[PDB]
């Protein structure tokens, strides 16, 4: 309860740990930790009836975010861990259900079978991407096909268990926790080009209400970069 | 029975991957197959279950010839001969049957003719990473610009494949099937199996289909 | 010199053999190892994780988020059916395209145990108590649910316990796992009546698999 | 006899083989070897030491000497800039024909690190100061001498040192060394301006190579 | 990775290094080389880095046949013969296809039929000196008048290449290409490398050329 | 490398030989044995128990 790092607090009250493996340290790399390890807060997202869906692109999202983001313009490579913090304030009268998975190497198809999405549909800066219950038209040239029960990729969407992950019911939970390690095939990868995870909150069971209550459920995520390190002199 | 399952298991198979024909009286007449895992709908799905992998590759060429209808006056020929030359990622490619490229030192060749053993070859782990990569979340690396998703890191060769004997008399037309076989996987991070049927080759673009085969009602 | 015999099968090419090989590229000088997280040694450690199982398919969710949600309403009637559905294996049923489901469809003869455990998603003023009846095969369904009780049983109390696991050995009428009403769903004012049902699916023991096959998911 | 089995890939030339070989000529009672000076056992012997680079092209310079001499006169403005060159490997860059550059013109992949030394050959009598300013990947060229003071950067003081030496890795916009005028150049009486510098280059640590490939200065 | 910079990674390789072609009919069609670093343009500029070579070597020829177009009636031929002689420094040379040269006891020659492994010979380090030269300055030794820059102290033999059999009914004509491989390297004196064009085969004679390639500005 | 001769009737078929084979299936873990009442180990067995002679034959 009432973790601090740096000058930002959260308060708490348990945690999945990645594939079982804590972060972790490996010219010469440098190791900054004072401008990195703090809480950075994206901006709240409503759930409301008719929802569907939403992702961030993990080292985009903070591309803005201060310190952190003049270090990805700066230092050509780099690895990171991450600390995600989802948590939904719903009272005692509303009912739902969320998954929250964090899904590495996430590649997403188009709406055309010939093209590829191009840079502004996969991600935006610290603004979610919404998923849409229906199906994208093939009239359209560039645009992520973001059909809910495919998640994007081809996949059943009651097969993305399998990532870790984290069920966040309105019932008896509150809130969500994932650590994730650093997953890549190269120990040192640019942090432009390349996007090596992907945080998906879908909605299966959709939420209900009566006539009276707040017709909107706010999440809010919070992430927080552990035992970065970039590639410089 | 728990050891039918493991990696080892699973994976070290044979399929035929490529399959094409050449002859030598073209002037043009040779063969290509950028290695990829992605060629057979059937092996692509069950290297799809994983995103890192990392192997030795095993490869056997089964060669077999066939008499085209020549002109007249008794042909009669040798035994014929074939050269596989394997190119490895960043190196000269052919673009006719007589060229440089072929009479290269680095560019590693096997020598065959028929009536006896298939030619087989092996390839080791080569990369600069230390896996390979199924999937790819981002654009490509050391480039101006880059098509989403491709992932250059991992580039295996080309293979390339044509008759060493030049006879007038009769042409000679020839197939070629390729077998695949990885051996020592390594496996990390698994990935749920595709849904939806697949389009191309280059990319994992879909059309959305449902999730499973309809019943009449719920009881 | 030494005086060798060959014997019959000596120059043909088997597919599943193992034998050494010429390597193509010797002296290279491979990439070493990196600790990549999460290894997979088995395939039986991709079973063992739950997963939701579309229970409510009936023509027109498939193609949408309804088909993993069961509807529960509050009714009228004195004992009624919730869901159900068989065991069979293979033939169009709910657990063939699931996690569980698609590593079994890549063997031919397969037995072991599940696990499957159920979730409330209601409010948390709302209670209630069901029935999760299992029949044996060999016996029928339950077509009511006073000889549902008689069966092997699990009564789910709502407002005390959120999530009731249910035990079931599995072997590639032959099983069912229907559930009944107990009492209906008692509900506050001002709070909805129409709550759902999640359902997942595991791998309770481990498997024992045998004669790997192709998988019919394909065109 | 012994019975034996002929594998896959037997009666084959793969051009990248190491056997057993029968010798032309045996009972020959070669020559032995003679303590000769100067035994190169491997190439990275040979890039340790150091070359002049051709700094100074210029599209008629090329074909004389004064492509590897640097002009330094005496001017007017505040501030200056001498040289410049980027590290972009392969593409016409000044260091691609040097002794380091055509021993990794023969590999794919390859990093290390770099000694510059410089050398003032001018007259005795004559000082000033140069700013010696290294750009890292990423950062772009400093179009200003101030800008360029807040990098990292070595000053050279040409009447106490006649040779400075800037080390630098270099990996396989991707940096810039380029060289200002801090002061002008003072000079006495009866004593010339206009004068020269040399550029050096050299492997400052051990290299590593791998996957050898022919070079493209070739027809 | 230090060890494939090595001298035994460098040039223990394999090489095209002739081709060429003879008849059988035609009384005079046979082959020769006189065996040589400098043929290929790729191999003599790997060599020529060093001053003082010393290796054993290795050779394999890939022999394949043509039928030329005969006259009529059902040409029907045997299996063909080929003999492959080597002439060590200071032996006797044929000059027809049907010589005594060919019959004589001192020259080692191979006996080879279609169909079958390719004809591997090693031929040891076969000299006067301790090493050899592929630079000389000075004139011919042990002779009354010398070329400049020749050395006839390295002189490592011919190959010769010829049918065995004599058939009137069909002509055919056969290719040879020679693969050339050092073995158990030794490397003295380093020497910079080649940048002009080669233009002869015998002498280092060339046109000047501009050091590198040039830009517009030296900023 | 090593140097081998063949010696006749090396690449012929006979019936009667035993010699080692590929395994057309490996890795395929196959059922251990089960304790089966009743087990023939040699074919003298068979004939020790005793049987009925058609002593009557008789044409009908």
């Known amino acids: 309860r009432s973790i601090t790092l740096g000058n930002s607090t959260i308060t708490t009250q348990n945690v999945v740990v990645g594939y079982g493996v804590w972060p972790e340290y490996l010219d010469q790399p440098t190791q900054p930790d004072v401008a990195t390890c703090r809480f950075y807060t994206l901006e709240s997202v409503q759930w409301m009836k008719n929802s569907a869906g939403w992702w961030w692109k993990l080292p985009d999202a903070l591309s803005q975010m201060g310190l952190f983001g003049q270090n990805m313009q700066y230092h050509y490579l780099g690895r990171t861990g991450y600390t995600i913090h989802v948590q939904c304030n719903a009272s005692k009268f509303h009912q739902g259900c969320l998954l929250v998975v964090c899904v590495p190497e996430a590649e997403m198809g188009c709406s055309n079978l010939n093209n590829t999405p191009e840079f502004s549909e996969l991600s935006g800066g610290d603004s979610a991407r919404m998923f849409t219950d229906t199906q994208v038209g093939e009239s359209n040239a560039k645009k992520v096909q973001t059909a809910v029960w495919n998640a994007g990729m081809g996949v059943g969407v009651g097969n993305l268990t399998i990532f870790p992950h984290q069920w966040i019911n309105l019932r008896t939970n509150n809130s969500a926790t994932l650590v994730m390690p650093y997953i890549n095939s190269v120990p040192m990868d640019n942090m432009f080009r390349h996007n090596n995870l992907t945080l998906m909150i879908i909605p299966f069971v959709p939420l209900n209400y009566s006539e009276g209550s707040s017709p909107y459920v706010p999440i809010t995520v919070t992430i927080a970069p552990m035992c970065a390190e970039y590639n410089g002199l | ?219 | 010199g030494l005086p060798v015999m060959t014997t019959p099968g000596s120059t043909q090419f088997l597919t599943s053999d193992d034998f050494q090989s010429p390597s193509a590229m010797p002296q290279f000088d491979v990439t070493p190892e990196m600790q990549i997280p999460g290894r997979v040694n088995n395939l039986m450690e991709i079973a063992e994780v739950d997963s939701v199982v579309p229970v409510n398919n009936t023509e027109d969710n498939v193609s949408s988020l309804k088909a993993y949600q069961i509807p529960v309403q509050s009714n009228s009637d004195n004992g009624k059916q919730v869901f159900g559905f068989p065991l069979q294996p293979g033939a169009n049923n709910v657990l063939n395209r699931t996690l569980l489901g698609e590593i079994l469809n890549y063997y031919t003869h397969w037995s072991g145990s599940i696990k499957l455990t159920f979730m409330f998603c209601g409010s948390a003023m709302a209670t209630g108590k069901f029935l999760l009846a299992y029949s044996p095969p060999g016996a029928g369904v339950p077509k009511n649910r006073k000889d549902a009780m008689l069966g092997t049983h699990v009564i789910w109390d709502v407002g005390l316990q959120s999530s009731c696991v249910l035990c079931v050995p599995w072997i590639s009428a032959a099983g069912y796992v229907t559930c009944w009403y107990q009492t209906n769903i008692v509900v506050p004012a001002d709070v909805q009546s129409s709550c759902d049902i999640l359902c997942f699916v595991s791998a309770c023991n481990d498997f024992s698999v045998r004669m790997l096959k192709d998988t019919p998911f394909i065109r």
Request: net charge positive; glycine share 6%.
């Open chain 2, 1 to 219: 029975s728990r050891s039918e399952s493991s990696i080892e298991n699973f994976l070290c198979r044979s399929a035929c991957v490529y399959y094409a024909t050449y002859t030598n009286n073209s002037k043009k007449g040779f063969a290509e197959w950028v290695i990829n895992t992605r060629q057979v709908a059937q092996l692509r799905r069950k290297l799809e279950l994983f995103t890192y992998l990392r192997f030795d590759l095993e490869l056997t060429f089964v060669i077999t010839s066939a008499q085209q209808p020549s002109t007249a006056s008794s042909v009669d020929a040798p035994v014929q001969t074939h050269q596989i030359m394997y190119v490895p990622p960043g190196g000269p490619v052919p673009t006719k049957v007589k060229d440089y490229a072929w009479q290269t030192s680095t560019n590693p060749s096997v020598f065959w003719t028929e009536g006896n053993a298939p030619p087989r070859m092996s390839i080791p782990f080569i990369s600069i990473g230390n896996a390979y990569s199924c999937f790819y979340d981002g654009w490509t690396q050391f480039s101006r610009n880059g098509v989403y998703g491709i992932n250059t890191l991992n580039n295996m060769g080309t293979l390339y494949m044509r008759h060493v004997n030049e006879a007038g008399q009769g042409p000679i037309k020839s197939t070629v099937r390729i077998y695949f076989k990885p051996k020592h996987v390594k496996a990390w991070v698994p990935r749920p199996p595709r849904l939806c049927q697949y389009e191309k080759q280059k990319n994992v673009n879909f059309s959305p289909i449902g999730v499973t085969t309809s019943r009449t009602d719920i009881i």
